[model samples]
Target: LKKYTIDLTERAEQGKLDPVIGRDEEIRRTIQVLQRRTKNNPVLIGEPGVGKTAIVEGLAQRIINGEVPEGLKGRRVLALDMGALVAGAKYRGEFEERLKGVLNDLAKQEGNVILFIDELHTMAGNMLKPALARGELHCVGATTLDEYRQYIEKDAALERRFQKVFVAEPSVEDTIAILRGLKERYELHHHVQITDPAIVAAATLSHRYIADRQLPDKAIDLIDEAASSIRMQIDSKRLLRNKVTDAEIAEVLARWTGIPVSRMMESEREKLLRMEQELHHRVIGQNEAVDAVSNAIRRSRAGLADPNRPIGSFLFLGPTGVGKTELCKALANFMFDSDEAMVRIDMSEFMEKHSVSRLVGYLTEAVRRRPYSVILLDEVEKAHPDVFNILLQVLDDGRLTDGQGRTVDFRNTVVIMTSNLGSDLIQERFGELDYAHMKELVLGVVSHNFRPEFINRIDEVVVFHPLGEQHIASIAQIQLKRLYKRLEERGYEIHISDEALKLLSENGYDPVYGARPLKRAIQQQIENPLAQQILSGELVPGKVIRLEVNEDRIVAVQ
Candidate 1:
């Protein structure tokens, strides 16, 4: 037995194993299964990284502490490292002889010896068949669900010899408890003050953001890495002692999840509260579009929205240059602090069904690298039918399995799809009808074009209005402000008078084309004249480039 095993109880006595925590129910269930007269061997079945091994270790600790029942007390639990047992058995019957010898040691103990085999699927049935058939050995085994069904469950005789005890992933509360028990040991090793909030944040954040790995183990790794993160900081800084903060815990999650952490200590509630104003700063007009996005985000943050869906899924229907795409960019910049945080998949590229592969290649990699992001699908109507079918899965399940079989989490991502499906009708009847009438007419066009399931899944159908004179004037100023910043970089202090702004808006304003014409007007009327003056040496550094409306044109007066 010594050749093929290690005593977990003996290690618990020597303080070799870490103190287990928050599995009283699981441990009791294990003992209940073990005490059975026949088929007493318990197999721990669960996904990897779910603390299956930790539960067994906790049982060992309890046995050594005499916290177990009278029948379990003084029992020796020998854990067979399956890899170690299987190693170096090159010849036939060599491995069987080794397993038999281990079983012989168990028989000598008269049911006092409990055999533990981890990854029990690695051993062939013939190797343990004789011993299991004898029914004299007390055994505990662990294997994952896939292997259990694929390997052991297929063999009925092998499956019947052991009682199955499913080890589910610990909940966030239990993970926090597990982390608390192990906190002292980690603090001692890393020499940092691990705050309660940090521990709670790790468990909660990992559960919400990390979809690939199971909990308790992932949570435990976060705490370990967080402590080590601060420990290294202190060790490198030499004079600084950094208390592990929730921000640091978030950074740990960010590193693992590939999301960019917010640099400001800004409350999301405040951001969501002022969402419209924040978006309006960048997206010039389209109040309806901005408001819809804001409310959707607020509902999500308030936990009023469906947790299984994307944070919010909306179809933006409007004329070109009517601030639909701009609103998305503004939202991404506001939420993630970078316009690049949004994933822009141009539907023109996905026109053919087979071209959906481009989406799978880029979209999965993008979301995998940045789970929390804004995904903007421009001209969604132009995308192939298969694309909408693929999107249906994402909108409904908050995940999409790529061509490579990797599932990408979109639960944290906000999905915005822009289309011209109802733009023709909007131009024909926008101001002629009231807001309700316009929405109804536009949706009529939209419902007819897209499938019912796809249309029904959208959280909102934001109908962007054509830009008017007042919206154009405001947009002119925003564009001029951007120009001012560029001029300032060139050592020119720029000021455009109210009359000049009015002229700029009037020249560029167009109902049919929206803001697209306005940008050209600004460039030709302001940028060109200013560039000419600077190049002609009429304008110099530190001089004010004052713009005014004179002679029915914008002129720069320095």
Candidate 2:
């Protein structure tokens, strides 16, 4: 940090550590660790972005200032990349020997030397025995709790040698203070003047509940991006555009697509209403399914996407092509305000046991890059039942490690799993059931397949109804109008006859299959004419075309 132009003195003299936020308590606690002169070192466990690295940096600064009891005055800190350093030990013990020599050298220099390992959870292999065993090294490590167990807890003998210090996420008020402190540094470091709104947006961006993963960091990235963009824009412009304002920065941040808290809270309320209305406009008669799923997401977003709480997991069970998956995207657009926010994972991706690691990340990787994002596992039936077996840890424990070895915390995400298999079986067995019975039957299969512990984590279960005459007609009208809209954009006057509408209904209708048949149906009756006219040179882009099914003109219109 000192070599990088980061301050070690300001944090120490003021009794805090982070350049962005304060860590007085951590300084006090580590001082306690040194004052006690205990048998084991302090183990700092936390989620990413919670100031673990900063806490130890502050400790090192104070340790330099004689803040330690006079006996430990000579103590200094050496922060190493635990992941890279551990890999070095595996290739050759040279790294371990070098670390040992550093510790022994510090021991001989009259003052104690502190070993600060970032991502220390990656250092628990037998390969690290020399460094972990060093009597002269007072080791302090920082890692997400998930990794700590994956690497450290396996060795009970070594695990018992350290005391844990939990570095939790700050409350909103504390985070605000952290943001303020960070604001000065953002300006000083990035050379950008950010507004208060930008600060709030940046502060809240750290959340997956309101935003996506790694938001605080992402927001900082946004600030830099905006500054760079503003510089270019200013340089390109002549007079008025030469000066960039904070409002421009806020607008740039808002336009990045992931809606911030202030926007979501306001827009979420409005968006839910709009999504229901837009869906109603498009689908016509499937309002019930829309209401159930939208209400569940609203409730989940209002307060439930917290890291310390159970994840808001849900299963949307319904027949094929009945908008179960479609609703997931719509909800993502409404609640999260990003059309692409919900990651729809085809269950076939996890059909093999080895494939399960894809969802968790990898066996050993960084936690921040993989976590706190929505995952929609569509067609859950296609996935191996053994897949559920691996999901127990993530579903019950709110954490997972994917194939790449990165730790992911799902505690703040919403998982929507959609299934067609159980719903078909339910309808076949029960024969035309009402919503209440349908819900019960679906839940029964879900409960039977997954344990109560896993099921209990779910916020709700949504079931989509198979299409009927009303839904089919709704589908037809939507397609026809969308076709008309495209034609109109090309300056073509468009109108469809009543007979053509009736033909569209009867000739293409598949009540059992519902809206999905429309995909194929339109290929024949609609796009064929539109394309034939355009391609034959007989129809200009602005030419009007109409279709009719006059009952008298033909005995049948296939």
Candidate 3:
């Protein structure tokens, strides 16, 4: 009904919207819509937090301040949460009833009422006719393509009613501008001077795919949170007033970034090296496999790659007892720096060819409802050929088709498909050809996917070697260390004899099961005996218990 501040245009012009640089054309088109003496149906389709709402806010602010001229003057543009109507509805909630009244009244309002429908797709459900009925209430609807298809276009009849205006991604330069411009407002509003470099730094970190985030919005949210927290801290501690220094800003950014203060200022090289070291900890003896994957990361970040274009899908083909799965975990940690963001789906999940669609998606369903740092397609070779058919799109185009027939962008995802198919064959070619060469030959057989590009999209085919004595020993050592840490945390003075450690490592070295046997080996050698000692009240939490192994029993002693 009535609008006041939040002027994106003025914010951009006055430099209050730091780095609000791009979208000049989109802004122009919108102003053109707002400038219309009469209304034209224009829907703004874009990703959330991509300045769609900010642009409208900027326009509204300019209009309020008389900075915008007569045609756009007094444009009472009220953005409505189309999602709000049905959000809490269940017991015959009158979503349509509520919207009809808002639209009808806004249409009749005295000033030029521009109705901004957010989540526009979610609106045209039951309220389709009501939204359509009010011809006077000119609409500016904003919804993502995903949302547009899922909610609005689900009913083809409703889709026909609005003219969709596609909002493509802003170039890096543009996103930077948005960040810079927005930072300026914070400076003016909060009476703080946040620098341009700081703004850019935050923006860049957010853009990093390794960060698993796209924009500064979440980063901004954190910065704001941190800034406010600092403000309160300063206010409470009487640390000083009238300003926040670069040091304070750094503190805020570090916390906002979710990186420990200790790890701040970590160079790109350091991050890569750190990842390499972490990968080395597990997947022991698979140094080449880890290198194969991490090199892709270096290439990806070296301006030689388009991260969003979905580069680097892996196919790890090896035997059952090999380090195939261990390499998957190592690579996931290597790329994203955390296992949580990375994912693993047992190829066993897709035992049926029909289930393949669920992993890769078919149409209209997002393949990545939860995007992963790594998608470990364990036992992918065991999965039927039909599953490979589903992967044809994601494999080639870096996108997957959901069940709804919608194509999702998967070009940025790291796909690691692990299989033991080459185990028998690997030995056949081991002497004649290199492992890397063999990997290529195996992937070549599965070439007839949906498109040629799918095969080309593969960044690497990692070949994991079967776990041997040393590999098992290294894994057992790691597991022993873990158990030791747990014992120490509980104040247990626990030690494992070298003899016992070697015994555990050698006992479970099954070529078929690979590093997996180490799980049982660790449980038996260190964890079980130590845990029993503690539980039996024989050992205190703060004391170390020595486990001396014999031919029969893993004995626990103080």
Candidate 4:
């Protein structure tokens, strides 16, 4: 036992442990529990990364500094290596005999021994039952709350032998202060200067982007990674001045969480002011819908929206091939600047009332990973009634508890539910009625499909207008420019005449179906012939292929 045990006090004497910060109350409570006559063993329970083990190290540091009570003076805190004790114990009784031998060796210390066990739930309850009953051992154990409930609480007798100490996670302010406390050590090791803004960004961004890990740990990790990254850059530059900045910290966070930090650091005022114009670049002919979305986002940024609800909750009512889904993709790019920033779920999959859990399962994981993203529910009207009830929780409270009991945050996300419920009304009343009267008719259709409580929670109900021939020429030009971009990547260029654009738009535009036919028309007219020309070596790199309209068909000539 003496050989296998780590003398934590001796290590503290050698200054081997980093200083534990902002856990004074927990450390004091642990000491009070330790000074008791019976049930002297105290178990620290908390979420993982909450620094349960650090409190024990603080206690050890106190003892080494002669700051502990008279009873704890000159006593050593030994950490038992369970693996070392269980090693070479292949036989059934061999393991038990080894444990007994270690216990007998600890008994000779005459109450001076305080054993520290981390992940204490792994220790068999039967082995601890008899020893703790006699009050023969002074121990401090650290384990997560879930493991305590799952493993320790199951053994009623063994659990009663130790006092429980709850260690709550530190708040963001506390985390920031803690980082400042440990900043010197990291700076010395990484040889990089960490700015105050970087520290603040570390705490705030980690709290928002890093969901799996708790505070202080996550914040510290951000600083460490950022410093290391800066150091690597310095080494590559043959020793340039190494300094960690807020932007560098944001870059590290982006890599860890798959977020676009550079875009986030860009001019937000410029982006928000031109939100409609930026979205229009990708999704055309939806001016009203774009304006409504822009206003909601601006309201959210101005702190006028409900904090308990999502950033924006809207039901997109429109026909197929309209800009409903396209608007969602555009908003995702505008906000996160990444294709993976949008979580699109086909509401048609949840048409059966019994399958709502399946839908919830996928959405919960996606939202957990990206709490600050856009959630697009396609064809929402097709969903069963139960699905609406489940969504009501998210739409109202900006949170959803999944089947596995993890609460996913939606407050930072924009929730857009698409439906075709009002498409027929919009098509019939396209040019016949004003928007206000048309909105009333559309709501009448929407109310028939969704419950009032659900509709009432929506921040806005945007009706996407169907695309017409008047809008097709520009939409067709946008499509043609996309093909131009692809060919430009291969060192080639394609030029199309105005007549060719007119031909493509005329072949694609359908008032009832929106721009769906336009997509097919561009593929058939441009891509097929381009592919054939490239395969035949007629349109190679550094060649300009001019596209023209001949007999109502696109003809490409080099």
lDDT of each: 0.62, 0.52, 0.52, 0.63
Number of the top-ranking candidate, with lDDT as the measure: 4
Q: Candidate 1 residues 1-558, lDDT tens each?
A: 454676877788875775566667777888888887767788888777676677688888778788889998888787775555577767776666666666665666777668788878775546566666454566687888887887768878767777777877777876777666666776656566656686777777777667567775676577678767767666573246477777777776667655556532457665455666555554544566656666766665455666455332334444455454554544544544435555565554444556654434254444465455565555555445566676656545555565646444445665544554534544421122234433555245545444565455456566555433344535434665666677556665667676655544445434466655665545455666766576565655756666665754565656
Best by TM-score: 4
TM-score of each: 0.60, 0.53, 0.55, 0.69
- Total clashes, candidate 2? 14
Q: For model 3, how does the per-residue alpha-carbon lDDT over 305-359 read when each residue is reduced to its tens digit?
A: 5544444334545445334445454454333344553345555334554564333
lDDT tens digits, residues 91-150, model 4? 676666766666766666767777888878776635755676454566788988888887
lDDT of 2 by residue, 1-558 (tens): 223222333446555655434567765676566455344567777766666777776566556567556766655555554333343344544565644433455444332445666777666335445444445456677778787787668767657666667776565456666666556666655544455564454445445443443443444455567667677654353355443455555556566654544453455467566555556654334556566655645755554444333333334454445444555544544433334354465553344556654444332333344444455545554445577666545444444554533334444655544443434334321113344443555346544454555455544455544333323444445676766666555556556666545455556443356556666544454555545454445555634456555442222211
Whole-model alpha-carbon lDDT for candidate 4 = 0.63
- Candidate numbers sorted by TM-score from highest down: 4, 1, 3, 2
lDDT for position 196 in model 2? 56
Quote model 2's TM-score.
0.53
